[PDB]
Every structure is written in C-alpha cells, then in structure tokens.
Amino acid sequence: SGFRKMAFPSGKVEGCMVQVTCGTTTLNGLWLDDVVYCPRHVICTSEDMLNPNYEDLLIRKSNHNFLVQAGNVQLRVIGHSMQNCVLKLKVDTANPKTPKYKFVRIQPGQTFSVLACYNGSPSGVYQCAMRPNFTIKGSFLNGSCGSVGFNIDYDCVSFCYMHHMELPTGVHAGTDLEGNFYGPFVDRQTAQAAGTDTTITVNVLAWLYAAVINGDRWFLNRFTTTLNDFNLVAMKYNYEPLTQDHVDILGPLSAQTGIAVLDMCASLKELLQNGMNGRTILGSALLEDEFTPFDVVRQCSGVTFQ
Amino acid sequence: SGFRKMAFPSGKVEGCMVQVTCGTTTLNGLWLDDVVYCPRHVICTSEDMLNPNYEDLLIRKSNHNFLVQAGNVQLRVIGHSMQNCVLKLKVDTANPKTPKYKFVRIQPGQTFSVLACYNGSPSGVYQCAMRPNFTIKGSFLNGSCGSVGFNIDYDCVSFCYMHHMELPTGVHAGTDLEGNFYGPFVDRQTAQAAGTDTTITVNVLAWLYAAVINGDRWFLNRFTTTLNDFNLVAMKYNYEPLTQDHVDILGPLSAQTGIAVLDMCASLKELLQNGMNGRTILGSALLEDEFTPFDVVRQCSGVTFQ
Ligand SMILES: [Cl-]
C-alpha cells in the first residue's frame, strides 16, 4: 500500500542528454539517432531575447559554431535546421544508447516525468501535469532549458515536452519535440498571458478512488448527483467539466471499489461546497489533481517497465 | 525557479536490479560487483513468515535453489551467506554496470530516493524521508521487497535502504545494506509497534527558506523567538526539538535570504499556533518536513551528477 507522486525511471532518457553551446549560451539537448534536438534560443544573446529574429540569427551560424558534448565525447555537427521553436543539429554519430522512442503531443491534464538537467547532466526527476492553460509548475533554474518530459510504456519512451522558458509569473512553458509550443506562448522575453487555470476534475476523482483503495474513506457520503448537477458545481469552483468520456475512463476504478462514478462526484461536490474541515486525504489538505486515472491504476496494480 | 520534490536520476541503480527467486517466492535484488543482495525472507513460504528460524531455513538451501535473473540473462550463484537480515548471493559474473558505490546508514530525518521495483524491473522513483520513528511512508505493493533507496553525490551511489516489509499500519520498514533494520522492527509477520512519530523541525525550516527563495513569503512575520521558547512550542505540537547543530546546518540558507534562523522559527511558531488560514506555501496546505537543508540548497544552486 501507500500512494506517492512517482516519476518514471529516468535511465533511458539520461543516456540521451547532451550539452549544446552556441557562442555564449549553453543549454541541454536531446540526442536521438544522429540528431540533437534543442531550443532554438540557444542562438540568442541576452539582448536578443527581448525581440529575436530567429531566421536572421540562424543565418549567421554555421555547423562549427555549435558545440555538442555528450559526457566527455565531442560530437561533430554536420547539419543544422530550425523546426518551429526547436533546433535540429545533425551529428556524424548515432547515439548508441538511443531507446525505442516516439514524439507525442500530450493533452491538457495528462502527466509526464521531467528530467531536470544542467550543462547536459541530469540533476533530478519529478512528475508534472500539463495544466489546462498549457503551463507546468516545475523546478527549472537558469540553464535548465532543453530538459525534457516523457512517459515510458514498457520499453518505449514517449517524449512530450521540452523546456523553453519561465514566464514572469514563475510558471513554465515549452514545446513538443516538433517545436510547437503548448499554449499561446512564444520564445521571447515579454509579458505573456497564460489563460485562467482550472482544476482537472477527472484527476481529482481518480485520486479520491486511490484514497478509498488505501483506506481513506471519511469523505464518502450518502448522496448521489447527476453529471449535469455536478457540472454546475464544477463551473462555480473553477473545475473542468466532467464528460461521459471521463466517466468511461474512471470505469475500472469504479469497479474495483464498487463506488459508482456519480457517487464519487457527489462526495467531491460536498468537499467543494464544505471544504475539508482541516482533514487530510492521502496526506494532503488540498484536493490533488496531478494524478491521471492511468497513474492511479499503475500504482494500485504494479506496472513495470523494461 | 520553482521547487519540487525531486528524486535522483535512477539510471545508475536501474542497471543493478535483478530478480531473485528462491523456491517459490520472487523479489528484487541488488547486483553489485559479483554479489547479489536481497531480503533474507525470500527463503520463506507464507506459513514460514509467522515465526521463521532463518538459520534453520537457510540450512535447507544450497546455491542452486536461488534463481538470479538479470533481464533475460542468468547469473550463476557460487556461494551464499546471511548477513543479519540480508542474503548475499555470490555470483561468478561481476555486474558490468556496477556504479561507484558505498553502503551508508542514514539518520532519522534524512532523505533518499526509492526505485520501486517489481520482479527485478524498475517501476518508478520518488523521494522519501526516514521518519524519526524509523519508518518510511512509501508506495510498495506485493513483490516490491528488495527495492532500494539511495543518494548520489556526483558519481557515487550511496545505498542506504532496502525494503523488507509493510507493517499492519500500512507504513514501511527496512534495513541498511548490511542487513540491520532501521528501528525496532524484525522480519516476521507479527504485529509490530512503531514509536510515536514527530515532525522533522529542521526540515520544515529548510522548506520555509525554500519558500522565501521562490517568492512565497506571506508567512514572514513581525516577531522573533528564542530557541527555548520555540522548543516549548515544538514539544506541544510534537515537533522534534531544535538544537544548535540544526541552527548551524541552516546557516547557509539564513545567509542567502537575510533571515536569521531564529526569525524563521518565529514564523514557524505562528504557523503552528494559528494554522495557514487557507493559504498555501509552495502549493502545500500543510507544513512539509521531507526536504533536508541540503536538499533545498541542492535545488537552488543546480547540482548535477555524472
Ligand atoms: Cl508525494
């Protein structure tokens, strides 16, 4: 038993992290087969980032201006190109540690593991959720750009996030591995509005189910509700609307606990209207929304990876 | 910026996990050089665990009863021995992926990363604190025994914990890598009392400093305190007494922030007595005690590992 926020084992991704330097700037890149992927703002100086013309900046660069280092091994750059907001550097050696991998663009509310890296060296691993407003609440110091987020399915790494920037509000923004930002953000140093954020309702429900499975049951009540009545309460409290697709995803947990999804919605409704009265659930005094239903099943089943 | 509960990158430990099978029980082992380490209870059946005589049970076994498996390839066991609560299985092949490593016995209040494993395959990684009563609050299903906890200082893996059992209270107990249990626990399926737990005061203080460094600061107050008057309050709320050594350990965070340790204790005193009033520090509605002062410093200067 027990329930923890748990990251994937980071070994397969560790072997892909490299250091990329261009002029004065050093950040992280991802070495897969014979291509290194990194944020295009590696080519910017401090003054550039206020209003960069990335096409004009890149024209000034040649292959030998890019210093790519994997451990102590220096890679030779034989081609460069920009794809949206990511730089793709062709190198003359394929990474022998390349795992089976895919590039995925995840949906808001899905979770992934982040390997935070500095100067191409891994510093730590932790689990993140893509907020409904397409930001993430990470730990990313100066130099962490190019760190990646991923999920592992047995032996396949699905890369879904590359870190690019910190907004003035202290939240974090980045791209998929084809270089397209999540959300409305651009890679320049300006004020940028993130949307109103909202709580990921289906994730809160899944975590209530995990609490029931681990014996935390004080919040179960004698009430039920409807999808429509529940959603009136959700909008009031800045919660995402629950859909039937979400009800279907919660089906397996409903069956393990014998608690119908709309009955668990009734319990969440009462927690939203009445608060928690200074009580805790799974060691938390807030409602937690960074566990997907799949996360909860994996941790209440024992899913393992190659 | 940002502050997260971060585990060490687990790659160096992944390559050491093997599956150990004795007769009919299967758990995890740690393959280091030419030795595999695992919980000695692997040699027990279900009925055995109620009152085991491990010396007698081990006499019934020989080298060929232990099936040690690394991925798909097989180790030859050429010798076995029992060290306290740990089985040492000598194998004829040194693990080619053995990292630089050390066996360490940690202190209550210190932290480490856990690589949760099932059938010798890594499933996830998370950070844990050794509670003052020598339990840990992990996530450990059936088959997770032999999972290990560790820290990394650059290139050296310091193994400090091996998982042995889940207590009837749902908390977790285990040994160092010499096989000595942390706490009063034994490897026997019996009701076992863990002591009263307490909150790790020096860790709560370090986390308050992390909060100030990251911009959460509403809890800084008009007041100061003495070490003695603070401890009077700490005892009331079941916090560990703060000592001068603890003040010294917090010295560097005091110097970065310009907030004397005893002023931060005054902030903690007012939080214990008044609560958080529905405000959150670093996203938490509770006082967090699973970050050590070194953990905070490490995540504010960007320490990496090779
Ligand atoms: Cl957690």
Curated annotation (Swiss-Prot), chains A, B:
Coiled coil start-end: none
Domain Peptidase C30: 1-306
Shown part of the complete sequence: 3264 to 3569 of 7096
Name of the protein in its database record: 3C-like proteinase nsp5
Effect annotated for changing P132H: In strain: Omicron/BA.1, Omicron/BA.2, Omicron/BA.2.12.1, Omicron/BA.2.75, Omicron/BA.4, Omicron/BA.5, Omicron/BQ.1.1, Omicron/XBB.1.5, Omicron/EG.5.1
The reaction(s) this protein catalyses: TSAVLQ-|-SGFRK-NH2 and SGVTFQ-|-GKFKK the two peptides corresponding to the two self-cleavage sites of the SARS 3C-like proteinase are the two most reactive peptide substrates. The enzyme exhibits a strong preference for substrates containing Gln at P1 position and Leu at P2 position
Effect of Q189A: Does not affect ability to cleave and inactivate human TRMT1
Impact upon substituting N142A: Does not affect ability to cleave and inactivate human TRMT1
Subunit text: 3CL-PRO exists as monomer and homodimer. Only the homodimer shows catalytic activity. Interacts with host FBXO22; this interaction promotes the proteasomal degradation of nsp5.
Localization annotation: Host cytoplasm; Host Golgi apparatus; Host nucleus
Membrane topology (Cytoplasmic): 1-306
Functional description taken from the UniProt entry: Cleaves the C-terminus of replicase polyprotein at 11 sites. Recognizes substrates containing the core sequence [ILMVF]-Q-|-[SGACN]. Cleaves and inactivates human TRMT1, preventing tRNA guanine(26)-dimethylation of tRNAs. May cleave human NLRP1 in lung epithelial cells, thereby activating the NLRP1 inflammasome pathway. May cleave human GSDMD, triggering alternative GSDME-mediated epithelial cell death upon activation of the NLRP1 inflammasome, which may enhance the release interleukins 1B, 6, 16 and 18. Also able to bind an ADP-ribose-1''-phosphate (ADRP).
Activity regulation comment: Inhibited by pyridone-containing alpha-ketoamides compounds 13a and 13b. In turn, alpha-ketoamide 13b (tert-butyl (1-((S)-1-(((S)-4-(benzylamino)-3,4-dioxo-1-((S)-2-oxopyrrolidin-3-yl)butan-2-yl)amino)-3-cyclopropyl-1-oxopropan-2-yl)-2-oxo-1,2-dihydropyridin-3-yl)carbamate) inhibits SARS-CoV-2 replication in human lung cells. Inhibited ex vivo by michael acceptor inhibitor N3. Inhibited ex vivo by compound 11a and 11b.
Catalytic-site annotation from UniProt: H41, C145
Effect caused by changing L205V: In strain: Zeta/P.2
Domain of life: Viruses
Glycyl lysine isopeptide (Lys-Gly) (interchain with G-Cter in ubiquitin) cross-link, renumbered residues: K5, K90
